[PDB]
């Protein structure tokens, strides 16, 4: 067409202050990682080749070692996404047999992924216990039978519940699973690699290393979330299970590509090297209450001149994680702006059609810019784009 | 581990002359493409955001307008890999129902992908017809029944047969398909986008545009083969079928990643722009017989001075496509070497262990460098590595 | 401990108006004297003075219900639990009932939707996800056996994040299209719109939900209705009659007390005396009226030795059983003591005569004033000094 002249996929300025943003492409990547991906993809590589033996070799093989070490699992595996990892795990272990799960955990993440729908297409039988808000242990145990193949737990990533609510301590499931000799599978989904409380964020958000040490047979999660990697189905646990999973032919359709594989490796390397500030998602969530102010007012300083603009700086409690930490509320600083000639709604609309475009949160005709998600070289382009729409 | 300090994924000089090489990571990507991927991954984007509506939209969206226009198909879709495409098509259309395909088309490509084995895990019931070598139309038709959902043909990318062999022309399948009101599915696999004869290579190799205007209902293929794109399952055909496929839960687990999607988009943009020289595979396969020599002797000029080196330049016919054009042979220029002090075999193993490493063809204790697969900036790297090993 | 009653009056300093543990809605003294009068001797419980013969007890109430909800008819059983059980078992025995996966709730310890729907004899057809449920989920599960389209309201909890819910509007449409009836378990027993009282919320009520075309609606008496314990059902005549006719309805029959109390509560409603029903008063109390009451307490506690007293402004949640989402501004009277830890102070406050139940944060004992009566205060002081200074 003539709308195919210029690419439809384009870089976007996130002013929503939502670190994990489903709509905006989730975790962005460090320039360190990306030059590595670029480097790998510019020409040929050792992808499925073992240079030592001069023959073809497993492409997953290196990535695994990282995960095995960082996380502590017996073994591991990686596929296209977590969605597939779930599907793969189910289809491999639970075909035609029962899978027990809480009525509180049967979740739709995104538009196209529904636990029960994919479990059906998985060829597994869903056995749902407890209630929406509350689920005891007696619920999981009571549903065990000759045909129970799997005890599964899903972590509610994109919503939370408050009020009267009960949940089952993972410790309990694993106890149950030993008693009846049923394996425990945990879709964590955020793919948090290590404990959050290390970095100054106080939350009960589960991770690989810790859940592994709990005794959960299998755990999966996304690469592109709290792990701040490329899109990836990350699976870790007991050797005999992973081996069974790898053996499944479906795993071939779910096989990760050169780019993600490399970008992932690099991401993992950073983790071993303990370079947390070099993965953008972690950085953005661990930023200092003052740093946000410092970056907030530097924008106001660039916005005062423009005609017709009332600018304020506010301090607010907002939720920072969209896809990963729904309960989390953190203090941050937003630059609020209002215009005489135009409503905020017509202002956000124009901000979306800009080049480059800018997406911002909105509260009662107060256009807001959360600085948690804003880069330093974004400021310059924000000003330039604000003056071009109104000073045209 | 000790070797975890450094990534195992490293760029590899390809001296094999094998453009599509499974072990070397299939298609390399043009710099223009990688920059766009880079650009996109650097920060937040419109991946799952529709800027015009200011709400979530699908990622697949951006690409499809391109595929449509280029292929001539009614609509299209993209998934992780062609393996997934095949799997997704079968599960979507053929679950619990019979699929007819030739006994000569039931392929294993690579180590992990087997048509019969995937199709079984597909949930689709394999109706095999005809013989390995010979398969007539009557074979196809004869096996049609109330339970026949699908008429499938797979292209034999990785092998061929000689002697007494017969096959069904596609026109015919389409005909049979109209007759019984059953849909025709063709896995090309090589995902060649357009006609090869335009580029000076005379082969009957199938492509999307052509196979669509023959009246095939669904066609799939890999992105990183003869399309020269990133790893992707590429599916094009009738709207009603695509819709059905899209709506499959499993499609979510087959969803392509941010990187490929963007890389893909750029790949297509170049195609639309008819800028073929900028797509590394095509260039490599269209290179002038003369250009080869020009690059070949340019390396020799660099190797004369190095001690103990017997350098020659030879003309040969070797097979350039690894995973796509198995019967094809093309004229090419290898720069062959031998050393008095070292055996070529000990030379090749050292070459594999270099930084960056070098994979080459061996013939009769003579080292060959096929120039078809060799970049201009590799030469300098070659020279520097040869002298560092030999003259040290 | 048979030598004195195990049940006792209790001072709620929790600031939670609907409180499961503390007895839910307290009753207006107007109401309670009416209950008293009736129960003092014989009455026209099941008797028609005009015709000189037997007549039904639920009679008295239902005129009231029908008018205030606008429904064709109504019925009242022991508690909403039974109401739900009764409706399901009457309408859906052996048949399928469609319900969102988000609405299958445990309210309290002993009441679970799926469990009771099981023992109901109804067949549970669950659709959608925990977080999200669309219309197509509901529609798609409709078949020859589908007896009932059921929505349950999440009273004792809520969800935030990515959430999707089915407009009641849409359900009633669905139910007309396939000619299935729609059953809404509100649970809170909100009778009329909240935004009339200055509370801005989408909280569903009988009147509003009846006018939407829901065939049946149930709720508890002792929640946002501020009445005694009661299963309250309103809707279509055909359906109420089927229900009243269930022989189980007779096991779920309300008593003379709750009947009496309930009728008087309703009188109040028709007479538009909202301020005379504790629960509504307590949630509609003015932000300064809480200070005014908070600092009148302080003034009583200054003299007592060893007490550090302050007065704070906070955002807490007022409804325990009914409005789980609602945070409202309120004033707490906070207190510390040098000798005793807050923890040990709390435990002593609960062993008091009369006892006192209060919130706790970080070694700062709090009294929320939202749930405390004027005559409570004198008794607070009198009991604080008797513990600390004994
Ligand atoms: K991928
Ligand atoms: K009763």
UniProtKB/Swiss-Prot annotation, chain C:
PANTHER family: L-SERYL-TRNA(SEC) SELENIUM TRANSFERASE. HAMAP family: SelA (MF_00423). Its main location: cytoplasm. It is an enzyme of class 2 (transferase). It is found in: Cytoplasm. Pathway: Aminoacyl-tRNA biosynthesis; selenocysteinyl-tRNA(Sec) biosynthesis; selenocysteinyl-tRNA(Sec) from L-seryl-tRNA(Sec) (bacterial route): step 1/1. One of its GO terms (cellular component) is cytoplasm. The keyword DNA repair does not apply. Converts seryl-tRNA(Sec) to selenocysteinyl-tRNA(Sec) required for selenoprotein biosynthesis. Gene3D superfamilies: 3.90.1150.180, Type I PLP-dependent aspartate aminotransferase-like (Major domain) (3.40.640.10). This is L-seryl-tRNA(Sec) selenium transferase. Pfam families: SelA (PF03841). The keyword Lipid biosynthesis does not apply.
